[PDB]
Amino acid sequence: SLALSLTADQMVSALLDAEPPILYSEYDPTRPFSEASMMGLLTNLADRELVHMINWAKRVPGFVDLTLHDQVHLLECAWLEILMIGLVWRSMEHPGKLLFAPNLLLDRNQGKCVEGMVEIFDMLLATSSRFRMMNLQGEEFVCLKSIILLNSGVYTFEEKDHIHRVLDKITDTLIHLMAKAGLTLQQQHQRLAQLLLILSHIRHMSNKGMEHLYSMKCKNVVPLSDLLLEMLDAHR
């Protein structure tokens, strides 16, 4: 392979290098939101982010080793978790707000612009708050996002074995960063656990968001791109 030959420092470098750009919203700030307009802005952004996510994924060490079918499976499983952890990360230094884009920074209360969306906002904000509590580092974040991509769909597949070897290497990398940061053995293990347990909350949020997005689609509050519709249809 190639992923398994990477040192921890080289893994961090690769993951940082692979990072997708932060996109802007087409949001016109002079006009008030409507339920339709806000959902349109959010889904337009997500669709554009998805194209970049696919390029990022191909640069995650190990991912390109997999068959196209397995690559599709992993992305279909994890796409919303990945968008969401990205969102939470961007919003980390903006307590009480969600930085969907640099020009679309939404208060908790603006979640109420859309039926049933404030509950999802609350969960995202709590995650961002937790990240803040932990002083999550950029290098840790990129490891976590890569773990989500490789892990979320891995149970439902030598393909699995290889992915678990790559996952082990990312664990090694996270520990490496913690050691470098001067954490004791006990602190390293505790922090690794804290970080990975957040992924359970991220899964939860993805599932809830997936249901919400699907309801907005069924009620026809807003149109979705063919790509977004297919990623959503993959979950049911």
């Binding site: 696919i54 690559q71 790509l227």
Partner: peptide
Amino acid sequence: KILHRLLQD
């Protein structure tokens, strides 16, 4: 399937 196409390209 669009994802399939995007991954190929």
